[PDB]
Design a protein around this nucleic acid. Structure first.
Ligand SMILES: Nc1nc2c(ncn2[C@@H]2O[C@H](COP(=O)(O)OP(=O)(O)NP(=O)(O)O)[C@@H](O)[C@H]2O)c(=O)[nH]1
Ligand SMILES: Nc1nc2c(ncn2[C@@H]2O[C@H](COP(=O)(O)OP(=O)(O)NP(=O)(O)O)[C@@H](O)[C@H]2O)c(=O)[nH]1
Ligand SMILES: Nc1nc2c(ncn2[C@@H]2O[C@H](COP(=O)(O)OP(=O)(O)OP(=O)(O)O)[C@@H](O)[C@H]2O)c(=O)[nH]1
Ligand SMILES: [Mg+2]
Ligand SMILES: [Mg+2]
Ligand SMILES: [Mg+2]
Lengths: 454, 201, 393, 441, 62, 104
RNA sequence: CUAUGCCGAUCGGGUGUCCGCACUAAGUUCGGCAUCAAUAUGGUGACCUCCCGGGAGCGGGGGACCACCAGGUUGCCUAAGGAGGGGUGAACCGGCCCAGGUCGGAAACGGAGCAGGUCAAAACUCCCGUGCUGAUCAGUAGUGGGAUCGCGCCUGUGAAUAGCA
C-alpha cells in the first residue's frame, strides 16, 4: 500500500499517511469524478493512469476509505484489509462520527497511525505465505471428475425498478449499472420510521437520475462565437452520426437559429454518398435566404452552401470550406457529414482523419430518441475511433450530443440517459419537430418527471 | 439565519469554512455533500449563524442552490483570483445563476464576492475582477437566448451597461486568502470576512 | 429430484433474459417467452442430458421461431393485374432507399416496375428518387411544383396504368402518431390510390418504442408485410418482433446495406441465429403397395410370424404341433438377433452371402445355428420367389 | 548508415491500436496483420504451400532497414499476448503457465534481434535501444517468474541505458524516455520490497561494485559509443546551432545542409565578379522560401495553440522558423552586397531612386529581422547586431539620397549631410572620404 | 485571378483557338469512355456512389 | 466334488482375460479335452471326462473346444489324493508340458 | 507619340482537380495446410505377470507396460500447440448397459455376447482459437512521376502592360 486516505463525504480529509511516497494532488479527485459522474461498475476498482485505486463507502457515517497501490498487481489481502480496519475505525470513534454536525470532527483528533500500521504489517505477514493453490486445484480436479438497510431486503424493488427503467427505453447494461450504483449508495444507512424503503430508494434513484442527466457545465456555442470572432477566425462545428438521424434537419434548424441571432453562417456539405443531399441543402439555403434577405442584415450575405459535387473526398472539401470562410470572414462554418455505421472501420477512419485535419472547434453527435440498447455501442465506437487515431494525449472526443425526434415518444426518454451515462458531455440541443422553429433545449426536471411519472 | 458558501469546483470554499471555524489548516478534498455548522460571531454578543457549505461541482450546484435558497439570510460567493482568467465564463455563468436565484427571494440577502488564492503573485486585484465581471455580464445577459422546452429575469433595463450599482442588492468585494506560507503561518487575512459578518449580523 | 436442475434452469433463463434484452427486445415479450418456456419445461418434466445448455437454446430457438411469424403466408404479386405497393414508416427509416431496392429487385425478376413519390413536406425529396431511379434505370414520376401528395399520386398511378406497368410503388413521407394531419393525409392517399399492399418499414436499431407506432398504423389503415432495414450494422433488430405482434404479418425482405444491391428476402433461421448470438441448431395401405410391388423384406416375414404365433394353433383354423411352435419361436429369436439394417434390406440373402461375418455375428447373438442360418436364408429366398411370382400375376 | 527508433515505433504503434485504453487483443491482431503485410511486401516467404521452412534474417539481408522491424513486431506480438494472458489469468490460473511460455519466446526474439545488431552496418543508436528493450523484457520475465535478483539487475541496466540515452538527446526528445523510466520506476521498488528492506541495502551496495567492476568496461564502452554516435549524428545527419538546437526530424533540414554547402561553395567560387551566381542565388532563394513555407505548414497549428492560452511559452513554437528567416535575410544581405559591388563598379537619374528603393527594402528586411527575435526576445545580442546593421544601412541610404550629384538641392543637401555626419560618426574609410568630398563640393 | 501554366506550350499554341472542353475529366466520363468494359452496369450498381445524376432517358413527367 | 478343467485354460492364443491361466510360452496350440484327460490319467485315475458340455467363454462352436475334465485331488477326508500335485496349477502345467510330446 | 488599366496595374513559383499510372500504409472478404512434450496424483480400457480361495461360472489382493480422459507443478518444445466446443462410434472388432437366446449350476446366481440403448476416458472428423499461407476488393490516402491554353488554393513586387504610323 503506497497510498491510503480516510475522509468524510464533506470533502474534509480525516487521516492519511501518503507522505513523500505519493501526493494526493488529484488521485482521489478523479475517483470523486468517477463516483459522481459515470458511476464505477468495476466492483470497487478504479484504474487511474498512474496507479490503480480501490474505494469503500460507509453511508452510515458518510465516510469513504481509499487505498492507492501501484499498477503492479498486488495480492488478495488488500480488500480484506479495507474491511477490517473499517470496522476497527468504526469501533474506535463511534462518538465523533455518529454526530450529524461536522464541528465534532474538527474538534476531535485521530491517532490512527499505530493501529493501521499494525493491521498493515499483520496483513503483509499473512500475505508472505500463500501456498494453498495446490489444495484448491486438487479439490477442483476432484469436483470436475465428480433503521439499517440490508441489500437482500431492497433487492426486490430494485429489480422491479430496473424493469421499469427497461420499459422506459433505457439500455439493459445502463440499467444494471444504475441499480448497482444506487445499491452502493444505500448500504446500512439509517432509515426513518415515517418513510418507507420503496419511497427512500425511489427518491435516491430519482436524485441520481437528476445528477447524471445534469452533466458538466452548459457552455453554449453562442458565447463561443464571439470569442472566435475576437481573433476573426471562423468557428467550426461538425455534425457526426449514423445514418437516418436527421443530421440535415437539425443542421437547418441550427442555421436558422444562428441567423435569427444575427450571425452569418457557411454550410459545408460532405454527404457525397447520400443521393440528393447537395440539392436538399441547396433548397434549405434558398429557404433561409428567402427568410433573411442580405440587405436587411446590412447588404452582406448570410448563408452560403459549399460543395464540390458527389464522390469527392470530404476532408478536402472541408478544408476548402474553412479556407473560403476565413478569406470571406464568415462567422461560423457548419459541416455536415454522411452517416456512417459504427462497425464499418474505413468510414470511422475517414471521419477521424477529417476531424484531426480540420480540428473543428465543436463536435456534435446526433443521436436518436427512438433507438435503444444501441446508442451506447455507437458512442463507444465513435469515442474509441476518435481517440486511437489521435496520437496526442487527451484527444479531441465528442463534445456535444444533439437528441432529435424527441416529439415521437414523449415517454421513452430513458434512451437519452444512456447517452448521458456513456459520455459525460452535456446535451446541447433537443429537436422536437420538422419545422425550423423546433429547436429547444433540455429541461432535466421535466425529463426525470416524465421518466418516473409511471 | 444561514450563510451559504458558493463557488466553482476546487474554489477553496471548504478551506475558508474550516478556517473560519477552527483557525487551523486541515487537508481537504472536493466536496460531495453539504456541510452545516453553527459559528458564533467573535463580538461580545456572540450571536450564532449556521454556515452552510455546498459542493462546487457543476453536477450538484443547482440542486443545492434551489434547495437551500429559502433558509439563507446572507450569501457568500467565492471566486478564484489565480485561476480566474481560464474560468471567467464559468464564474460569470454561476454568478448570473445565483443572482437570478437570489432575486426570487422575498428578502434580499447581502452579497459578497471574495477573491481566493490571493496569497499567490498572479492573483488579480479586486477592482480588476469587478471590471471583468461587469464586462462579461454585459454580454452574458444577451447570450441567454434558448427555448427551455418546459419566467425570465433581467439584470438591467435592456439599454445600459450592466452595473452592480443599478442592482437592488448590496454587493461587496474584498481580498482574502488563507492557505499557508504568508496566509496561515504569517498572519491570517480573514479579519475582513469576520468584520463583514459582524456588519451584516 | 431435479433439485439443482431448477436452480440451473433459473440461472440459464436469467442469462437468456440478459442476452435478449441486450438484443433490443421488448421486455413484455421477454417475460411472456420466459413464462411459456418455463411452462414447457415443467410439462416436459425432464431435461436433455446430451448438453446442459443445448436443450434450453433449442427450446428458446423454437419459441422465437413460433413468435416471429404469425403463420400467414406472405403476399406475392399477381401477373396480369397491376399491383400497387404503398410504403409507410417513421422518419429516417429509409423508406425511399427500400423502395429503390425493391424496385430494382423486382426489375431483376422480369417485371415492369415504376416509382411514384408522395413525399412533399420533406425538402429535397424528389431529387433523391430521381438519382436512385436513374442509377437503376427505372421510370419515375414526380414534380417540384405541386405540393398535395394525393393529386400527384393519383395522376402518377393513372399515367402508369395507361403505360401498363406491372408493378407500381408509391412512397410517402414518414409520420408519427402525434401528428394527426399526416395520418389523415395517409388515409386520403390510400383512399385515392386504393393500394394493393401497404408495407411498413422500421429501423432495426429502433426498439421498445416502435410498437405504439406500429399499432397506430395498423389501427388507422390496413397494413401488410413489414420490411426491416439497417441489419448490416451491430443492431440485431430484436424489437421488430413486437411490430409483428402489432401487425400479425410476416416479413418479406430485409435491408443489409447502404447500396441498392444489398436487398435480400427474409429468412427466419439466420435472423433467429443472430438474435440468439450462436445459432447452434441441429435438425433431424402400405402393405398393399409393397405386395403389388413384390418387394419382400425380413420385416414382413417377422410380422407374419408374429401374427401366426398370435393366432395360435392352426388346428383351430383347420377345424408335432409343439415342435412346430418351438421351431417358430427359435426362428423369431434368431431373426431378432440381427440388426434392423439387414431386416429392412430388400435382398437379405445377398448381404448375408457377401459377408460371412454377419452370419458369425448372428450365430454369436443366438444359439449355434451352424445350419439353421442357411436354412432360414433358403426359406426367405423361397418366400421372396413366391412373393415376386404373386406380384407378377 | 541505417537506423531505427525502436521505442518511438513501438510507442506510436501501441498508442493507436487499442493499447491507449487498455486493450491487447486488437493490438495483437494489428501486429499480426502488419507482420503479414511486411512479409508480403519484402517477399520474405518462409512457408510455401504444403511445406514450412523457418528462416532467419542474415546480415546481408537487413540492408533495407525493415527486416529488424519484423523481429521487433514478433516480440511485440508475443509481449501483447503475454499481457492479455496476464489479464485473463485471474479467471483461470492455468493461463499463467501459458503466459510464461510466451515470455520465454518474447525475450528470445529480442535477444535474436540483439545478435542481429552486433553488425557494424546498423547504427549504434539502434543498438542501444535494442539492448534496453531486451533488458526490459528479460527483467519483466524474471519478475513474473519470481526471480528478484535477475529482474532487478536487468531493470537497473535498462534504467541506466534509458537515462544515458535521455541525457544524450535534448530535453524535448528525452521526455518520452523519462516517461518510460517512470513506467519502470514502481516495479523496481516492489522488487526491493520483495527482498525485505533489510538485506536490500547490502544487495544494492554490492550491486554498485558489481556494476563498477564487471559492467564497468561495458559502461565505458557504451559511453564512448554514445559520444561517437552524438558526434557523427551532429556532423552528418543532424544540425546543432545556437538557434533551434532541437534536431529537426523533417527532411527540409537536408535542404538547409545543401544551402549550407552552397554557402561554402559560393564564396570561394565568386571572388569579385559574383555575376555567374545570380541564377544560383535565385535558385537558393526559391529553395529556402519553399523550406520556410514547409516549416510554416507545421508552425501554424502551434501558433493556434499559442493564441489559445497564455500558459504556453516561447522557445519551441518559433525555434526552427527563426533560423530559416535568418538564412533568408543573410542571403538578401549578400544580394545587397552584390548590388553595392555593381554600384561601386559604376559611378542616370532613376538609378539613385532605384537604389533608394532597394535601401528601403533592406531597411524593411532588417526591421523584420529585428522584430522576429524581438518578438521572441530569447537573446539580446542579436537585436543589438541587427539594430547596428539597420542604422548603418539607414545612414548609407541617407548619404546616397543626399549626394549632391543625386540631389540638386542647394542650401539643403549640405545641412542634411552635416546632420547625418554626426550620426555616421556615432555609428562608426574610403566611403567616409568620398562623402566628405561630396559634402565639400 | 490569372495564372500561367507550363507544359507543351508549342502544342498548346498550335490550335490557338480552344482546348478540349472536357480536359480534366475521368476516362469513364470522356466521350470515348475509354471503356474496356463498356456496359459494366451491374458493377457500377454494386460499388460506387449511391446515385449518379446526369441526363435521364427514363420517364420524367410533371 | 471333482475339480474342473477346460481346454480353454491351456490355449496360448486365448488371452488371460478370455480364459488363459498359464504363460503363453508354457502353453500349447489348440488343446483338446481328450489330450488333457489322457495326460492327467497317467498320474491319477480319478479323472473322468464328458464331451457334451463346453466352456462358458468359448464363443466358437468347435469339437476340439468342447468337453471338460473332472479331477480329484482331495480324498474328501482332509488329505491330498496325490501329494505330487497339491494345486491345479501343477496339473495344468504338467498337461501343457506333456501335450506337445503326444502331439508330435 | 497618343491612349490603357488601380494599388499591386505589367513579371513570377508551388499545389489541388488530371493519369488504363507506380508503390505503400491502413482495412474488408474468401480459401489452403498445420496444430508439442515431460513429470506429480487420481480415474478409465486393453494387454501381461504374480499370488489367495473354491466343484464350476467365479471370488480376494498386488504389479508390469501402452493408449486415452480429468488435471498438480512445469520446459534445453514452439511457427503454434487452448487442459475450448461438437459430431460419428461404424462393416460386425472403442467402451458401458446389455432383452431374448445361449452357456455354468439343483437352485440362488454368474459368464460370454447380438440387437437395441448409452458415452469426461478407441479411433476418425468438424468448429472456434493460434500459426503459416494464397486470393480479394474500394463511398479507406499518400509521395513517386506524368499531366497542366482553365477552374479552385498557397506564396512573391516592379511602376510597364497590350493598338496607332
Ligand atoms: N419528428 C421529427 N422528425 C425529424 C426530426 N429531425 C429530423 N426529422 C426527420 O427525419 C428525417 C431525416 O432527415 P435527414 O436530415 O435527411 O436525415 P439525415 O440524418 O441527414 N440522413 P444522412 O445523415 O444520411 O444524410 C426527415 O424526414 C426529417 O424530417 C425531429 O426532431 N423530429
Ligand atoms: N445502412 C443502411 N442505410 C440505409 C438503408 N436504407 C436507408 N439508409 C440510410 O438511412 C437514411 C434515411 O434513408 P432515406 O431514404 O434517405 O430517408 P427517408 O426514408 O426519405 N426519410 P422520410 O421518408 O421519413 O422523409 C439515409 O442516410 C440512407 O442512406 C439501408 O438499407 N441500410
Ligand atoms: N494558494 C492557495 N490555494 C488555495 C487557497 N484556497 C484554496 N486553495 C486550494 O484548495 C485546495 C484544497 O481544497 P479546498 O480549499 O477545500 O477546495 P474545495 O472546498 O474542495 O472546493 P470544491 O471542490 O468546490 O469543494 C488546495 O490544494 C489549494 O490548492 C488559497 O487561499 N491559496
Ligand atoms: Mg443528411
Ligand atoms: Mg469543498
Ligand atoms: Mg423517404
Amino acid at each position: 500500500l503506497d497510498f491510503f486516505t480516510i475522509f468524510s463525504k464533506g470533502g474534509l480529509v480525516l487521516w492519511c499517511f501518503q507522505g513523500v511516497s505519493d501526493s494526493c494532488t488529484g488521485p482521489v479527485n478523479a475517483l470523486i469524478r468517477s463516483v459522481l459522474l459515470q458511476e464505477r461498475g468495476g466492483n470497487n476498482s478504479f484504474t487511474h493512469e498512474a496507479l490503480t485505486l480501490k474505494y469503500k463507502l460507509d453511508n452510515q457515517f458518510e465516510l469513504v476509505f481509499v487505498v492507492g497501490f501501484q499498477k503492479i498487481l498486488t495480492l488478495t489481502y488488500v480488500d480484506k484489509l479495507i474491511d477490517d480496519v473499517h470496522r476497527l475505525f468504526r469501533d474506535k470513534y463511534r462518538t465523533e462520527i455518529q454526530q450529524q454536525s461536522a464541528l465534532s470532527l474538527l474538534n476531535g483528533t485521530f491517532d490512527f497511525q499505530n493501529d493501521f500500521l499494525r493491521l498493515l504489517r499483520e496483513a503483509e505477514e499473512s500475505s508472505k505465505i500463500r501456498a494453498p493453490t495446490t489444495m484448491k486445484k486438487f479439490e477442483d480436479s476432484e469436483k470436475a471428475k465428480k433503521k439499517s438497510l440490508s441489500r437482500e431486503d431492497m433487492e426486490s424493488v430494485l429489480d422491479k425498478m430496473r424493469d421499469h427503467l427497461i420499459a422506459k427505453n433505457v439500455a439493459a447494461d445502463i440499467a444494471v449499472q444504475l441499480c448497482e450504483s444506487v445499491a452502493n449508495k444505500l448500504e446500512g444507512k439509517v432509515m426513518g420510521t415515517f418513510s418507507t424503503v420503496t419511497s427512500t430508494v425511489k427518491q435516491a434513484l430519482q436524485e441520481s437520475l437528476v445528477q447524471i442527466l445534469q452533466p458538466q457545465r452548459r457552455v453554449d456555442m453562442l458565447r463561443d462565437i464571439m470569442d472566435a470572432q475576437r481573433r476573426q477566425r471562423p468557428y467550426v462545428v461538425t455534425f457526426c452520426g449514423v445514418n437516418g438521424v436527421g443530421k440535415s434537419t437539425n443542421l437547418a434548424k441550427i442555421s436558422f437559429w444562428l441567423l435569427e441571432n444575427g450571425f452569418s453562417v457557411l454550410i459545408a456539405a460532405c454527404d457525397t454518398f447520400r443521393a440528393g443531399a447537395v440539392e436538399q441543402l441547396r433548397t434549405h439555403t434558398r429557404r433561409l435566404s428567402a427568410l433573411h434577405p442580405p440587405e436587411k442584415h446590412g447588404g452582406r450575405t448570410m448563408v452560403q452552401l459549399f460543395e464540390k459535387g458527389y464522390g469527392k473526398d470530404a476532408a478536402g472539401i472541408a478544408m476548402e470550406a474553412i479556407a473560403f470562410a476565413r478569406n470571406q470572414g464568415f462567422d461560423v462554418v457548419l459541416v455536415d457529414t454522411a452517416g456512417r455505421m459504427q462497425d464499418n472501420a474505413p468510414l470511422m477512419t475517414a471521419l477521424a482523419k477529417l476531424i484531426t485535419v480540420n480540428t473543428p472547434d465543436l463536435v456534435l453527435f446526433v443521436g436518436e430518441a427512438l433507438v435503444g440498447n444501441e446508442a451506447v455501442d455507437q458512442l463507444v465506437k465513435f469515442n474509441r475511433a476518435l481517440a486511437d487515431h489521435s496520437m496526442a494525449q487527451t484527444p479531441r472526443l465528442i463534445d456535444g450530443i444533439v437528441l432529435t425526434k424527441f416529439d415521437t415518444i414523449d415517454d421513452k426518454v430513458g434512451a437519452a440517459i444512456s447517452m448521458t451515462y456513456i459520455t459525460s458531455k452535456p446535451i446541447v440541443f433537443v429537436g422536437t419537430g420538422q419545422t425550423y422553429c423546433d429547436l429547444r433545449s433540455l429541461n432535466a426536471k421535466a425529463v426525470v418527471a416524465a421518466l418516473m411519472k409511471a | 439565519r444561514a450563510v451559504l458558501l458558493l463557488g466553482l469546483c476546487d474554489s477553496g470554499k471548504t478551506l475558508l469554512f474550516v478556517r473560519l471555524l477552527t483557525g487551523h489548516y486541515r487537508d481537504t478534498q472536493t466536496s460531495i455533500t453539504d456541510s452545516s455548522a453553527t459559528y458564533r460571531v467573535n463580538n461580545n454578543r456572540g450571536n450564532s449563524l449556521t454556515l452552510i457549505d455546498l459542493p462546487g461541482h457543476e453536477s450538484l450546484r443547482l440542486q443545492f442552490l434551489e434547495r437551500f435558497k429559502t433558509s439563507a439570510r446572507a450569501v457568500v460567493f467565492v471566486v478564484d483570483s489565480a485561476a480566474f482568467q481560464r474560468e471567467v465564463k464559468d464564474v460569470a455563468e454561476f454568478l448570473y445563476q445565483v443572482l437570478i436565484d437570489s432575486m426570487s427571494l422575498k428578502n434580499t440577502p447581502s452579497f459578497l464576492i471574495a477573491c481566493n488564492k490571493q496569497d499567490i503573485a498572479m492573483a488579480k486585484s479586486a477592482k480588476l475582477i469587478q471590471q471583468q465581471l461587469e464586462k462579461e455580464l454585459n454580454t452574458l445577459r444577451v447570450t441567454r437566448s434558448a427555448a427551455p422546452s418546459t419566467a425570465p429575469a433581467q439584470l438591467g433595463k435592456k439599454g445600459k451597461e450592466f452595473e452592480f450599482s443599478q442592482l437592488p442588492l448590496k454587493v461587496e468585494f474584498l481580498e482574502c486568502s488563507a492557505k499557508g506560507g504568508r496566509g496561515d503561518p504569517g498572519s491570517a487575512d480573514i479579519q475582513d470576512l469576520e468584520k463583514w459578518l459582524a456588519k451584516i449580523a | 429430484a431435479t433439485i439443482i436442475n431448477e436452480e440451473v434452469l433459473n440461472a440459464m433463463l436469467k442469462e437468456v433474459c440478459t442476452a435478449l434484452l441486450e438484443a433490443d427486445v421488448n421486455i413484455k415479450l421477454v417475460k411472456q417467452l420466459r413464462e411459456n418456456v418455463k411452462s414447457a419445461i415443467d410439462l416436459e418434466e425432464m431435461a436433455s442430458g446430451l448438453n446442459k445448455r443445448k436443450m434450453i437454446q433449442h427450446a428458446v430457438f423454437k419459441e422465437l421461431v413460433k413468435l416471429v411469424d404469425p403463420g400467414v403466408k406472405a403476399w406475392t404479386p399477381t401477373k396480369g393485374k397491376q399491383n400497387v405497393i404503398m410504403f409507410v414508416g417513421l422518419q429516417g427509416s429509409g423508406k425511399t432507399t427500400t423502395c429503390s431496392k425493391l424496385a430494382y429487385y423486382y426489375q431483376r425478376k422480369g417485371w415492369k416496375t415504376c416509382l411514384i413519390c408522395a413525399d412533399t413536406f420533406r425538402a429535397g425529396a424528389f431529387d433523391q428518387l430521381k438519382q436512385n431511379a436513374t442509377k437503376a434505370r427505372i421510370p419515375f414520376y414526380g414534380s417540384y411544383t405541386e405540393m398535395d401528395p394525393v393529386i400527384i399520386a393519383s395522376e402518377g398511378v393513372e399515367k402508369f396504368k395507361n403505360e401498363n406497368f406491372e408493378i407500381i410503388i408509391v412512397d410517402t413521407s414518414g409520420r408519427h402518431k402525434q401528428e394527426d394531419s399526416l395520418f389523415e393525409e395517409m388515409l386520403q392517399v390510400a383512399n385515392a390510390i386504393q393500394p394493393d399492399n401497404i408495407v411498413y418499414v422500421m429501423d432495426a436499431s429502433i426498439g421498445q418504442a416502435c410498437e405504439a407506432q406500429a399499432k397506430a398504423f395498423k389501427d388507422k389503415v390496413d397494413v401488410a408485410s413489414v420490411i426491416v432495414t439497417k441489419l448490416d450494422g451491430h443492431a440485431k433488430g430484436g424489437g421488430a418482433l413486437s411490430a409483428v405482434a402489432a401487425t400479425k404479418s410476416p416479413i418479406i425482405f430485409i435491408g443489409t446495406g447502404e447500396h441498392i444491391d444489398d436487398f435480400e428476402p427474409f429468412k427466419t433461421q439466420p435472423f433467429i441465429s443472430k438474435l440468439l448470438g450462436m445459432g447452434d441448431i441441429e435438425g433431424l395401405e402400405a402393405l398393399i403397395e409393397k405386395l403389388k410391388h413384390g418387394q419382400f423384406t425380413l420385416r414382413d416375414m417377422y410380422e407374419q410370424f408374429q401374427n401366426i404365433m398370435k393366432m395360435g394353433p392352426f388346428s383351430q383354423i383347420l377345424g408335432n404341433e409343439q415342435e412346430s411352435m418351438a421351431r417358430l419361436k427359435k426362428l423369431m429369436t434368431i431373426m431378432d438377433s440381427m440388426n434392423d439394417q439387414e431386416l429392412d434390406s430388400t435382398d437379405g440373402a445377398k448381404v448375408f452371402s457377401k459377408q460371412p461375418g454377419r452370419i458369425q455375428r448372428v450365430a454369436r447373438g443366438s444359439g449355434v445355428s451352424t445350419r439353421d442360418v442357411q436354412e432360414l436364408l433358403t426359406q426367405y429366398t423361397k418366400f421372396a420367389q413366391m412373393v415376386k411370382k404373386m406380384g407378377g400375376i | 548508415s541505417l537506423s531505427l527508433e525502436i521505442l518511438q515505433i513501438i510507442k506510436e504503434s501501441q498508442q493507436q491500436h487499442g493499447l491507449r485504453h487498455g486493450d491487447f487483443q486488437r493490438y495483437r491482431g494489428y501486429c499480426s496483420r502488419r507482420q503479414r503485410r511486411l512479409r508480403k511486401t519484402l517477399n520474405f516467404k518462409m512457408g510455401n504451400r504444403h511445406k514450412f521452412t523457418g528462416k532467419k534474417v542474415t546480415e546481408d539481408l537487413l540492408t533495407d532497414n525493415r527486416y529488424l522491424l519484423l523481429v521487433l513486431m514478433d516480440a511485440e506480438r508475443a509481449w501483447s499476448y503475454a499481457m492479455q494472458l496476464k489479464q485473463e489469468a485471474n479467471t483461470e490460473p492455468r493461463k499463467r503457465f501459458h503466459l510464461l511460455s510466451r515470455l520465454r519466446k518474447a525475450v528470445k526474439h529480442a535477444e535474436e534481434l540483439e545478435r542481429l545488431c552486433e553488425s557494424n552496418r546498423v547504427d549504434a543508436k539502434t543498438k542501444l535501444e535494442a539492448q534496453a528493450y531486451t533488458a526490459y523484457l528479460s527483467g519483466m520475465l524474471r519478475f513474473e517468474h519470481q526471480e528478484w535478483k535477475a529482474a532487478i539487475e536487468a531493470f537497473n541496466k535498462c534504467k541506466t541505458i534509458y537515462e544515458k540515452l535521455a541525457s544524450a538527446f535534448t530535453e524535448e526528445q528525452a521526455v518520452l524516455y523519462n516517461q518510460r523510466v517512470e513506467e519502470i520506476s514502481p516495479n523496481i521498488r516492489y522488487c526491493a520490497y520483495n527482498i525485505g528492506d533489510q538485506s536490500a541495502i547490502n544487495e544494492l551496495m554490492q550491486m554498485r561494485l558489481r556494476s563498477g567492476g564487471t559492467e564497468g568496461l561495458l559502461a565505458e564502452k557504451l559511453e564512448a559509443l554514445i559520444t561517437q554516435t552524438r558526434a557523427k549524428q551532429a556532423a552528418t545527419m543532424s544540425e546543432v546551432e545556437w538557434r533551434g538546437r532541437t534536431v529537426p526530424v523533417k527532411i527540409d533540414k537536408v535542404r538547409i545542409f545543401l544551402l549550407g554547402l552552397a554557402d561554402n561553395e559560393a564564396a570561394i567560387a565568386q571572388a569579385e565578379s559574383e555575376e555567374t551566381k545570380e541564377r544560383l542565388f535565385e535558385s537558393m532563394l526559391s529553395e529556402c522560401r519553399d523550406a520556410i513555407q514547409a516549416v510554416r505548414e507545421e508552425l501554424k497549428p502551434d501558433q493556434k495553440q499559442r493564441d489559445y492560452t497564455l500558459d504556453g511559452e516561447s522557445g519551441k513554437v518559433s525555434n526552427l522558423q527563426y533560423l530559416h528567416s535568418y538564412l533568408t535575410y543573410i542571403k538578401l544581405s549578400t544580394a545587397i552586397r552584390r548590388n553595392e559591388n555593381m554600384a561601386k563598379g559604376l559611378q542616370r537619374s532613376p538609378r539613385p531612386q532605384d537604389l533608394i528603393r532597394l535601401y528601403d527594402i533592406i531597411l524593411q528586411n532588417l526591421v523584420e529581422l529585428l522584430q522576429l527575435p524581438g518578438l521572441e526576445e530569447d537573446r539580446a545580442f542579436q537585436k543589438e547586431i541587427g539594430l547596428k546593421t539597420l542604422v548603418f544601412k539607414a545612414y548609407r541610404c541617407f548619404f546616397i539620397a543626399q549626394s549632391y550629384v543625386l540631389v540638386k538641392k542647394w542650401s539643403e543637401a549640405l545641412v542634411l549631410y552635416d546632420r547625418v555626419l554626426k550620426y555616421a560618426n556615432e555609428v562608426n574609410x574610403x566611403x567616409x572620404x568620398x562623402x566628405x568630398x561630396x559634402x565639400x563640393x | 485571378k490569372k495564372k500561367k501554366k507550363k507544359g507543351k506550350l508549342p502544342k498548346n499554341y498550335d490550335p490557338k483557338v480552344t482546348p478540349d472542353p472536357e480536359r480534366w475529366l475521368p476516362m469513364r466520363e470522356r466521350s470515348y469512355y475509354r471503356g474496356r468494359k463498356k456496359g459494366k452496369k451491374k458493377d457500377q450498381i454494386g460499388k460506387g456512389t449511391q446515385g449518379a445524376t446526369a441526363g435521364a432517358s427514363s420517364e420524367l413527367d410533371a | 466334488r471333482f475339480i474342473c478343467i477346460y481346454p480353454a485354460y491351456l490355449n496360448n492364443k486365448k488371452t488371460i482375460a478370455e480364459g488363459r491361466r498359464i504363460p503363453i510360452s508354457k502353453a500349447v496350440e489348440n488343446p483338446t479335452a481328450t489330450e488333457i484327460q489322457d495326460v492327467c490319467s497317467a498320474v491319477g485315475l480319478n479323472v473322468f471326462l464328458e464331451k457334451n458340455k463346453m466352456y462358458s467363454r468359448e464363443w466358437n462352436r468347435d469339437v476340439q473346444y468342447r468337453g471338460r475334465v473332472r479331477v480329484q485331488l482331495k480324498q474328501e477326508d482332509g488329505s491330498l489324493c496325490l501329494v505330487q500335485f497339491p494345486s491345479r496349477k501343477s496339473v495344468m502345467l504338467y498337461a501343457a508340458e506333456m501335450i506337445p510330446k503326444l502331439k508330435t
